[PDB]
Structure 1
Amino acid sequence: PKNLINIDKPIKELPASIAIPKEKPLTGEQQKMYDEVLKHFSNPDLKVYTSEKNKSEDDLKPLEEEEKAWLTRECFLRYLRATKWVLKDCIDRITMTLAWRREFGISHLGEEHGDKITADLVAVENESGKQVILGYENDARPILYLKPGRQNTKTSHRQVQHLVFMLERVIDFMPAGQDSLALLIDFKDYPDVPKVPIGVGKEVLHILQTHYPERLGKALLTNIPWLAWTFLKLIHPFIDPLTREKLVFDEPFVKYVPKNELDSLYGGDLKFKYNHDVYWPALVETAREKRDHYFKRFQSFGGIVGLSEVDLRGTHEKLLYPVK
């Protein structure tokens, strides 16, 4: 019996023991395309749709300060890679995500600035700890645990709102220099949690594919029921090699996560029991700290579109990536 590490709150900072991967350098034509996107969203006269769902050319609103802070160098790069470096597609996708973010109630970088999705709104959804932000894996990705066997609410739109909220918070926890997350999915049934319309799948799929490009860096799956397990194993080789590498179906998590960063349930050193009244306020306060820092940094650098997340999340006095 090993000696585990007590923990009941999210790990605030990436430990120094985990290095941040180096970014792939951009070809000449890629930089040129990047500059066009930068130019498009730097336009002082830019106006975008008030929603995605009900978008109209005749109902537009110029960018808010908070939207400029979201429109980062890496945001541009995520969409460029998602759209396979097609300039018009990149611009439209970004535009539509801005549009969706206003509609959904998350365009203001936090409830502190007017977001309608609040911590208090979705807190009940996390009551049984069905989603947990905790730790960092080998490539400095923040970890999001998903535990559908701990489901505590009935299907509703609020489930989607919680889903999006937790995604935004795990993004708040990104270390400077990283912009993708790791999903750790535990499919076990937990009877300890009492089990309680339109299936939310379609909306969640639309949200993940359309508004969260290039965010899934790793997905680790464990405690898979037999039929699902068999299915996943039968199809794994037929999955495209570059997607295949991102997906791990029932292998030890310890090979992708350092032990002191991993829950002991899955072979790690962390002794974690979800305690809502302790965990939830810690996550909310920690996420808020990160956002305050990020936004202060953004204003200190001119409050312009195109700033780097490396700089906005970092602490160096001078910009590592100055804006053209």
Structure 2
Amino acid sequence: KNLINIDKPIKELPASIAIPKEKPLTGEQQKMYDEVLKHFSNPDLKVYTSEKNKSEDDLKPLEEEEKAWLTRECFLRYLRATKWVLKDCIDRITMTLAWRREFGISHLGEEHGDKITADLVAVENESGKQVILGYENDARPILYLKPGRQNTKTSHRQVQHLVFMLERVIDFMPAGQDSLALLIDFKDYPDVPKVPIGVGKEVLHILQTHYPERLGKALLTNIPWLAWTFLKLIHPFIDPLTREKLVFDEPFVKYVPKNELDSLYGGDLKFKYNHDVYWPALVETAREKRDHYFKRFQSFGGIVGLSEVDLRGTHEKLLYPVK
């Protein structure tokens, strides 16, 4: 039958998928990067404790978990997102640090004090409306979004749930990659009892402001007829780089290995969502990844600027020693 029955996240990137080569930095880009590193490596630096309630009178230094989040690639994502405008890059990183503090995820895990816990959001995922499973052609972990399986009413918890899953998919990043792939299925799921808007604006703000360069590819399917037409109509007018991220009306297998894809979309993975099995496995797997990540961070001096290639790897010597 060729189908592979699976019910838990795939812990590692298979050796069959190579890690895409990283685009090189120009002498000047390398110079701006050093400026960002210097700024955040300042032992006296203090940052706002909140984004929404930002106050020049309430600043706090970088904690250890924050220094571990301020990585080489974190700097690069912001540098590229702000089009290498040093001042904007610094400001954005600072505001995301403030937001992570206000939102309750600045500690890199509930085990370090995060207010956003697995138990807090677990109910939101009981119908499997979001699933982390598999990796695509460019080694990007896959996040399935199935709005047609909505099981709860509009609430702020829905936002915390989304942020939690995004942070988890990020934990699943293999060494050498920092972008994810979203597979969005708009189909209606009647088997899922439907529950009987402010959240939209907060979701948008978070996605556009605090997760720069995370969208590697977006695979769309079962798009509503009318929505499809509007996408086709505006498509010729979307910036080249962005349009290349959008994939639709194409074989998903063309972008995702067959054994890494849900059979529901042409792959070989016979996946059925079972909460009492999938959720505990996801949380634990993510936990082990961050434990390793944080342990490496400490073994390398616990300083700002370390590379995620090194933090997520096991090689003895640093591939990217800090200047």
Interval containing the TM-score (normalised by the shorter chain):
over 0.9
Deviation string 1:169-224 (CA, Å, 9 cap, x unpaired) is 00000000000000000000111111119431111111011100000000000011
Q: Provide the rounded CA distance (Å) in 2 between the counterparts of 1:40 and 1:22.
A: 28
1:131: how far off? 0.2
Q: Provide the rounded CA distance (Å) in 1 between the counterparts of 2:234 and 2:197.
A: 29
1:45: how far off? 0.5
Q: Provide the rounded CA distance (Å) in 1 between the counterparts of 2:245 and 2:16.
A: 22
Q: Provide the rounded CA distance (Å) in 2 between the counterparts of 1:209 and 1:189.
A: 27
What is the SS of the residue equivalent to 2:273?
coil
1:24: how far off? 1.0
| Partner residue in 1 for 2:189 | 190
Q: Provide the rounded CA distance (Å) in 1 between the counterparts of 2:251 and 2:188.
A: 19
Question: Structure 2 stretches of 5 or more lacking a match?
Answer: none
1:250: how far off? 2.8
> Structure 1 pair 199/249, CA: closer, same or farther in 2 (3 Å)?
farther
Contact 1:223 1:250 in 2 (8 A): no
Q: Provide the rounded CA distance (Å) in 1 between the counterparts of 2:31 and 2:234.
A: 40
TM-score (norm 2): 0.99
| Partner residue in 2 for 1:105 | 104
Following TM superposition, the consecutive aligned residue runs of length 4 or more in structure 1 with deviations greater than 3 angstroms are: none
Q: Provide the rounded CA distance (Å) in 2 between the counterparts of 1:238 and 1:62.
A: 44
| Partner residue in 1 for 2:139 | 140
Deviation string 1:136-167 (CA, Å, 9 cap, x unpaired) is 00000000000000000011100000000000
Deviation string 1:72-126 (CA, Å, 9 cap, x unpaired) is 0000000000010011110010000000000000000000000000000000000
Q: Provide the rounded CA distance (Å) in 1 between the counterparts of 2:40 and 2:49.
A: 16
1:240: how far off? 1.4
Q: Provide the rounded CA distance (Å) in 2 between the counterparts of 1:217 and 1:240.
A: 15
| Partner residue in 1 for 2:154 | 155
| Partner residue in 1 for 2:83 | 84
| Identity score, percent | 100
What is the SS of the residue equivalent to 1:152?
coil
Contact 1:156 1:198 in 2 (8 A): no
What is the SS of the residue equivalent to 1:231?
helix
1:25: how far off? 1.0
Q: Provide the rounded CA distance (Å) in 1 between the counterparts of 2:11 and 2:184.
A: 21
- Determine if the alignment matches structure 1 residue 207 to structure 2 residue 193: no
1:235: how far off? 2.1
Q: Provide the rounded CA distance (Å) in 2 between the counterparts of 1:294 and 1:197.
A: 42
Q: Provide the rounded CA distance (Å) in 2 between the counterparts of 1:198 and 1:174.
A: 31
Q: Provide the rounded CA distance (Å) in 2 between the counterparts of 1:213 and 1:154.
A: 28
Q: Provide the rounded CA distance (Å) in 2 between the counterparts of 1:185 and 1:10.
A: 18
Deviation string 1:215-254 (CA, Å, 9 cap, x unpaired) is 0000000011211122212222221111110001232111
| Partner residue in 1 for 2:3 | 4
Contact 1:219 1:247 in 2 (8 A): yes
Question: Structure 1 stretches of 5 or more lacking a match?
Answer: none
CA RMSD of aligned residues (A): 1.0
How many pairs align? 323
